[PDB]
PDB file of C-alpha atoms and ligand atoms in Angstrom:
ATOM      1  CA  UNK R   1      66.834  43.472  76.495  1.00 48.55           C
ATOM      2  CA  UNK R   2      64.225  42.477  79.191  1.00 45.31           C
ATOM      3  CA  UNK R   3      64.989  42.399  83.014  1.00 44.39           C
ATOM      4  CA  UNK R   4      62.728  40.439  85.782  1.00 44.08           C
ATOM      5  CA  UNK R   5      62.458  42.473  89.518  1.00 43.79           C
ATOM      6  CA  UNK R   6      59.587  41.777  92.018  1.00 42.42           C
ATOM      7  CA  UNK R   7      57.265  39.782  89.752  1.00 39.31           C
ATOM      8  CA  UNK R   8      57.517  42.482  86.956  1.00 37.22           C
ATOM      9  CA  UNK R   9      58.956  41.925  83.626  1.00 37.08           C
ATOM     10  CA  UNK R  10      60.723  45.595  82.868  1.00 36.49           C
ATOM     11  CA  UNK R  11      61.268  46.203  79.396  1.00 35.39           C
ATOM     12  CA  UNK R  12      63.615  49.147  78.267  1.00 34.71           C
ATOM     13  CA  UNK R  13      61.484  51.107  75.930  1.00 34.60           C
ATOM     14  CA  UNK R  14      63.774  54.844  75.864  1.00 32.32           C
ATOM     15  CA  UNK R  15      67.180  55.612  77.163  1.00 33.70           C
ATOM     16  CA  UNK R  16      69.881  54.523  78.849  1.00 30.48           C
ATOM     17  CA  UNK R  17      72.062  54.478  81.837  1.00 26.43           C
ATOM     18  CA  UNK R  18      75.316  53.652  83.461  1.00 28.32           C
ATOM     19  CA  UNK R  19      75.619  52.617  86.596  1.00 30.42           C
ATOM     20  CA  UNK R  20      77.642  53.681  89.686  1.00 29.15           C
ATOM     21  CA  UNK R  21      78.203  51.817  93.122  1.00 26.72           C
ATOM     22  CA  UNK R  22      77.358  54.325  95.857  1.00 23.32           C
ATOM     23  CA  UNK R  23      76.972  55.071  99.872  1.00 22.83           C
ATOM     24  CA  UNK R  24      73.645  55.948 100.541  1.00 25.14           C
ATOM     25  CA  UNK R  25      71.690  56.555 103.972  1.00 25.82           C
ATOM     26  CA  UNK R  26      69.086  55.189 105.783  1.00 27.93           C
ATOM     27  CA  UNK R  27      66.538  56.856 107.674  1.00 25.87           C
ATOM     28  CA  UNK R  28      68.286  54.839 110.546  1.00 21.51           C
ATOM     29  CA  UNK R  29      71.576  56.338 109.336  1.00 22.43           C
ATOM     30  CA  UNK R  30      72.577  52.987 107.765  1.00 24.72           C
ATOM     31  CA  UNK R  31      75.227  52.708 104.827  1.00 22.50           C
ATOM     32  CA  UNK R  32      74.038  50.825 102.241  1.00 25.10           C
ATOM     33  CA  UNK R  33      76.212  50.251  98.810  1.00 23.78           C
ATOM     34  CA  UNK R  34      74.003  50.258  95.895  1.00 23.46           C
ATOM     35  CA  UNK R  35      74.780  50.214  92.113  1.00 24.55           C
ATOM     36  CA  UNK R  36      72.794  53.359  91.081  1.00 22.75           C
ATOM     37  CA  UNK R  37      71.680  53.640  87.601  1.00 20.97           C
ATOM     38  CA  UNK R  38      72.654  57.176  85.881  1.00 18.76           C
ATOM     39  CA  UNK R  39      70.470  58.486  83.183  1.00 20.70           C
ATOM     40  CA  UNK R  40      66.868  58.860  81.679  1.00 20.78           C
ATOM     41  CA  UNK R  41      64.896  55.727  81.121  1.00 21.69           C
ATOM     42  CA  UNK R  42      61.531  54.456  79.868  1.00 19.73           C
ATOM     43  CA  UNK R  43      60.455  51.156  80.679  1.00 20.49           C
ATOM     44  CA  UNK R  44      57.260  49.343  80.578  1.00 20.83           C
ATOM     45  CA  UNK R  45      56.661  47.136  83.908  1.00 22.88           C
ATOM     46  CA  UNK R  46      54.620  43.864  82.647  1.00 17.64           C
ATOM     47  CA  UNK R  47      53.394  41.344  85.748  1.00 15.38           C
ATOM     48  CA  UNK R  48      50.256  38.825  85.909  1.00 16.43           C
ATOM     49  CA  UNK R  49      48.198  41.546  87.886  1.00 16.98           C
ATOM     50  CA  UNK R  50      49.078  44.914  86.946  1.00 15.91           C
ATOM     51  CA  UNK R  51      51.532  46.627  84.267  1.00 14.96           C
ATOM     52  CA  UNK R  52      53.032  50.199  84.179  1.00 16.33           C
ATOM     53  CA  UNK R  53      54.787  52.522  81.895  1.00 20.01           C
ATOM     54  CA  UNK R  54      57.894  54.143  84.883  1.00 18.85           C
ATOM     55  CA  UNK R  55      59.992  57.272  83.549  1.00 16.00           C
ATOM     56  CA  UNK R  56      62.597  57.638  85.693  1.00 13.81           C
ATOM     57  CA  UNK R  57      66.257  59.487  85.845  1.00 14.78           C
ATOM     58  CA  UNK R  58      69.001  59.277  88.391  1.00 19.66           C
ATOM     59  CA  UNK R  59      67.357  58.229  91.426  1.00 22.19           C
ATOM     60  CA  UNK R  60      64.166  60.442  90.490  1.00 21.42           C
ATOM     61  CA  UNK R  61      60.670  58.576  89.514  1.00 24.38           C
ATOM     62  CA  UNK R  62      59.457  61.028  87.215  1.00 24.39           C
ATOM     63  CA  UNK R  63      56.115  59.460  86.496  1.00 21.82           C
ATOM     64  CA  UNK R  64      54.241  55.682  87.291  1.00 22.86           C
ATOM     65  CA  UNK R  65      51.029  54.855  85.039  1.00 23.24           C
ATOM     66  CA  UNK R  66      49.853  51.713  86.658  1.00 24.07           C
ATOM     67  CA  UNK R  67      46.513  49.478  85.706  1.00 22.30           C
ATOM     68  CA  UNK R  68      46.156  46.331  87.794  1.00 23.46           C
ATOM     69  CA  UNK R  69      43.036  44.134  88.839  1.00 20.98           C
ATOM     70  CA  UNK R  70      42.698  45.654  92.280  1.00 20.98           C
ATOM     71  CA  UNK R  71      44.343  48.342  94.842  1.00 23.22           C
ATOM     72  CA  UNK R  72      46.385  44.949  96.035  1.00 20.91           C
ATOM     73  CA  UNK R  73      47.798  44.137  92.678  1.00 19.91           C
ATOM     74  CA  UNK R  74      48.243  48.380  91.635  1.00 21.82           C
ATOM     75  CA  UNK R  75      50.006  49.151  95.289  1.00 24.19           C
ATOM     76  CA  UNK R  76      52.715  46.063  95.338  1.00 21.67           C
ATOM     77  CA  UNK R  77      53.731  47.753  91.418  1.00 24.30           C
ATOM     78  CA  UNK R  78      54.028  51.251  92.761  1.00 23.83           C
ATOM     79  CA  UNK R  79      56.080  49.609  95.517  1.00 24.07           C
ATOM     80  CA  UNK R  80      58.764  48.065  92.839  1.00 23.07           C
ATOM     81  CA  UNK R  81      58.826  51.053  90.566  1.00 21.98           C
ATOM     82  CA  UNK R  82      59.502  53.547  93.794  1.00 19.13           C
ATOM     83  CA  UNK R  83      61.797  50.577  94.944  1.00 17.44           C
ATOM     84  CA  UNK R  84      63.412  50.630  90.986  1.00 17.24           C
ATOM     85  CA  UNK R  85      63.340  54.661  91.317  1.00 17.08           C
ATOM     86  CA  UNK R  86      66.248  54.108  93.815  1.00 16.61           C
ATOM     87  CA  UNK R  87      64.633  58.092  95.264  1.00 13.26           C
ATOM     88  CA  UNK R  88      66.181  59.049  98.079  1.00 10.63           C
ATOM     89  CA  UNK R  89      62.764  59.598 100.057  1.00  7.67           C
ATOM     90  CA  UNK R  90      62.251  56.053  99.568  1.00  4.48           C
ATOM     91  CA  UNK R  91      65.805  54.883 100.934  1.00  7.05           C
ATOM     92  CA  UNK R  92      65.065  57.306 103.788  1.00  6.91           C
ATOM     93  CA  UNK R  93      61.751  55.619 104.743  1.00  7.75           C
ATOM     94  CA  UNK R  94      63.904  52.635 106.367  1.00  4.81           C
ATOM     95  CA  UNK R  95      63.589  53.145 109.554  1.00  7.57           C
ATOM     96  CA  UNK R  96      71.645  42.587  96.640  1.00  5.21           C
ATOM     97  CA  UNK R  97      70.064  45.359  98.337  1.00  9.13           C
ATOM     98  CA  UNK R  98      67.727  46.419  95.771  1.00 11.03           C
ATOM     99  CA  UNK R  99      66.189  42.669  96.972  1.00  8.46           C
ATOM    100  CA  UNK R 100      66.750  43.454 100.335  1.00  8.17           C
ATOM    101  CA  UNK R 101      65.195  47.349 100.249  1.00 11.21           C
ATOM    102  CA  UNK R 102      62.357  45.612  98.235  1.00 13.52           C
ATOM    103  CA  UNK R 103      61.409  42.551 100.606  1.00 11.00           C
ATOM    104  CA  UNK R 104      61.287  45.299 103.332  1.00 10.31           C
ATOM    105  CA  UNK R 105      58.422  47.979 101.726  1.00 12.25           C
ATOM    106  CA  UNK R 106      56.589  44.250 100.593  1.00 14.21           C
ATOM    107  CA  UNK R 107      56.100  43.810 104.489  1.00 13.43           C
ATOM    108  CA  UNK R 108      54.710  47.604 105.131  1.00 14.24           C
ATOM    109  CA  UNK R 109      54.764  50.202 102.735  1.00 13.76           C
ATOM    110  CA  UNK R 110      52.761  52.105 104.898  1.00 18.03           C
ATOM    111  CA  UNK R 111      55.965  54.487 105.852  1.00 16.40           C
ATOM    112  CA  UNK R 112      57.210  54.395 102.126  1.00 19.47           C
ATOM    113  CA  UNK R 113      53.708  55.835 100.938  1.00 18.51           C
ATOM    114  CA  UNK R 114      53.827  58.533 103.890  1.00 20.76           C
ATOM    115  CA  UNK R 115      57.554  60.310 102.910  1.00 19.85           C
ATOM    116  CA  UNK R 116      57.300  59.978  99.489  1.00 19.61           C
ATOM    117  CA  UNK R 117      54.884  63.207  99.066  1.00 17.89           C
ATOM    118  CA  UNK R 118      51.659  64.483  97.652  1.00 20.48           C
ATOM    119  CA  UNK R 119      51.196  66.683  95.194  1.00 19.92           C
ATOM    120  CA  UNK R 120      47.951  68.489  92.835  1.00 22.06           C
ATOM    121  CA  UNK R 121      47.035  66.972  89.722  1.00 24.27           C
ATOM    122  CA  UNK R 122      45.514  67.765  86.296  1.00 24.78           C
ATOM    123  CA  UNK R 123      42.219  65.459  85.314  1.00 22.76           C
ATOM    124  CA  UNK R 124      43.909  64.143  82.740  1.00 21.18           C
ATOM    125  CA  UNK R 125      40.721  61.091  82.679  1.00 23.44           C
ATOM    126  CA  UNK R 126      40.871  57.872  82.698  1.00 23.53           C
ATOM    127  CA  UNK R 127      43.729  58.486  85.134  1.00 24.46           C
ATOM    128  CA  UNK R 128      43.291  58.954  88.313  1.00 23.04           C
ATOM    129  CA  UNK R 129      45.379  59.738  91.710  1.00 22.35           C
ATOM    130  CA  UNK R 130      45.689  57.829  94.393  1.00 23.76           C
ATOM    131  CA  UNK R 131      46.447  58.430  98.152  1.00 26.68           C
ATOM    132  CA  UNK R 132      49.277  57.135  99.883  1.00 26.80           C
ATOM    133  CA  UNK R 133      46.390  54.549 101.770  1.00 32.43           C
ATOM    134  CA  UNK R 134      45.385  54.017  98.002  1.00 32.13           C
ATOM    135  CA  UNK R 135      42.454  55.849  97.850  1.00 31.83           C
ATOM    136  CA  UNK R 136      41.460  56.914  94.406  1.00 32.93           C
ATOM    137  CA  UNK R 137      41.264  60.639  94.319  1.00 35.07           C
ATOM    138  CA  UNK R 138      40.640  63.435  91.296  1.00 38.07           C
ATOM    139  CA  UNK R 139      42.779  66.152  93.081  1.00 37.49           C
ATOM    140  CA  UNK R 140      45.599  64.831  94.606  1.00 36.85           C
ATOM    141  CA  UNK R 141      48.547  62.012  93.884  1.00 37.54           C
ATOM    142  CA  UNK R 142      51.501  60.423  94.917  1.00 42.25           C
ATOM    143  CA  UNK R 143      54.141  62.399  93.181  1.00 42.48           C
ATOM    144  CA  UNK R 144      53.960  61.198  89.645  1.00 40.27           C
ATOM    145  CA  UNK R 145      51.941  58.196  90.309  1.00 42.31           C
ATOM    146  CA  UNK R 146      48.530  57.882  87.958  1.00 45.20           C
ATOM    147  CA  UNK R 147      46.235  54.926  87.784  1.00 47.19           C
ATOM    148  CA  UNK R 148      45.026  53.712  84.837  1.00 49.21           C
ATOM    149  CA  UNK R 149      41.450  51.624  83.575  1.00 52.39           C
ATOM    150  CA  UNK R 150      42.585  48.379  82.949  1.00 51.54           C
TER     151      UNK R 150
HETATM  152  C1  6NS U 201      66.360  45.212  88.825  1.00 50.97           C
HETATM  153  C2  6NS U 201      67.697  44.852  89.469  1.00 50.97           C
HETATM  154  C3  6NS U 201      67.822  43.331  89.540  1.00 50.97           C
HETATM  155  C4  6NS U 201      67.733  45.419  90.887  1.00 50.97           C
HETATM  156  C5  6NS U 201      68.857  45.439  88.636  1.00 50.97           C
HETATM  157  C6  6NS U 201      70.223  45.227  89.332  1.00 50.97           C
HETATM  158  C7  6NS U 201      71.294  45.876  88.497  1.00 50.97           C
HETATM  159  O1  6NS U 201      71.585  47.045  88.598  1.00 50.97           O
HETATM  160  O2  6NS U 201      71.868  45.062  87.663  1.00 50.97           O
HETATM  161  N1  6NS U 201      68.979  44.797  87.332  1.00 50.97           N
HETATM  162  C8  6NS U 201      68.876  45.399  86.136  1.00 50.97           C
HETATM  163  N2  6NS U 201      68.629  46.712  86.208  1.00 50.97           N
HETATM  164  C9  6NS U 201      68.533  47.405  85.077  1.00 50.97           C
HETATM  165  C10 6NS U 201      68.258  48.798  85.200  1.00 50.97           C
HETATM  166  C11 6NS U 201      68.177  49.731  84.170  1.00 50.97           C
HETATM  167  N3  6NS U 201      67.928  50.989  84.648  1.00 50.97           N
HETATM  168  C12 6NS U 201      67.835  50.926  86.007  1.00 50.97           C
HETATM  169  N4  6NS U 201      67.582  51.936  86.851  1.00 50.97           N
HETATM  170  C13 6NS U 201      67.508  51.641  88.152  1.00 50.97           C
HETATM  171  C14 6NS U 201      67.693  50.305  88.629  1.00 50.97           C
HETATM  172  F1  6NS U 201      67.607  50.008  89.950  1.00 50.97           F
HETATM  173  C15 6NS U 201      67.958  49.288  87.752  1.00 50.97           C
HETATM  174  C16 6NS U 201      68.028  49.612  86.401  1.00 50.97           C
HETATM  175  N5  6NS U 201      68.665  46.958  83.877  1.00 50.97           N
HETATM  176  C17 6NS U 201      68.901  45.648  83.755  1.00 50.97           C
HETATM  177  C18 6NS U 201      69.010  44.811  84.859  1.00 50.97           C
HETATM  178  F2  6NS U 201      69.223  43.491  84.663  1.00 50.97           F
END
């Protein structure tokens, strides 16, 4: 049971949820009604430039493993699966409405990279972290976002 979002094919691989319409707000203090998805989930993320394996629970990205052809291709997944993640840091950063949260970060993700954190990583190799100006770096990440060798 495939799904299409932002040019990526998701695939449910583990899991399941339920979903719930709920109030969430803004970094402006805007209400926005949003059916969130309740539960742990899997899915592989397939598009014509870059593909990911997302783990995610209830608005929590618990880890992104993205390959793409280029920074351009790698940064506009993260986008969708922190979009998809339906985090709280990443509703907060404004400042159907998945679409409409989604065609905003496409413009400047800039501020979505910036409160969604940093943290230390392992070298696990052949994965690498990257900075929230995409970067590549050995040390530090984008909480639980790793880039893969395509
Ligand atoms: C991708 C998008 C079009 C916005 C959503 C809208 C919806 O909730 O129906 N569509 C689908 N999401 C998920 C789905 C499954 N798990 C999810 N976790 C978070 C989330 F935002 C969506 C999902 N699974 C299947 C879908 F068709």
């Amino acid at each position: 049971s495939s799904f299409s979002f932002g040019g990526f094919t998701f695939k449910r691989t583990s899991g399941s949820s339920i979903k719930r319409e709920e109030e969430v707000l803004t970094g402006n203090l805007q209400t926005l009604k949003i059916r969130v998805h309740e539960g742990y989930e899997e899915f592989t993320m397939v598009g014509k430039r870059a593909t990911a394996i997302l783990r995610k629970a209830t608005r929590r990205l618990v880890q992104l493993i993205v390959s793409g052809k280029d920074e351009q291709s790698i940064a506009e997944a993260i986008i969708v699966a922190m979009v998809f993640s339906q985090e709280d840091c990443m509703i907060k950063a404004v400042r159907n409405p998945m679409h409409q949260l989604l065609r905003h970060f496409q413009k400047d993700a800039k501020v979505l990279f910036q409160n969604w954190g940093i943290e230390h990583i392992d070298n696990v190799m052949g994965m690498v972290g990257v900075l929230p100006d995409m970067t590549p770096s050995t040390e530090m990440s984008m909480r639980g976002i790793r880039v893969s060798k395509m």
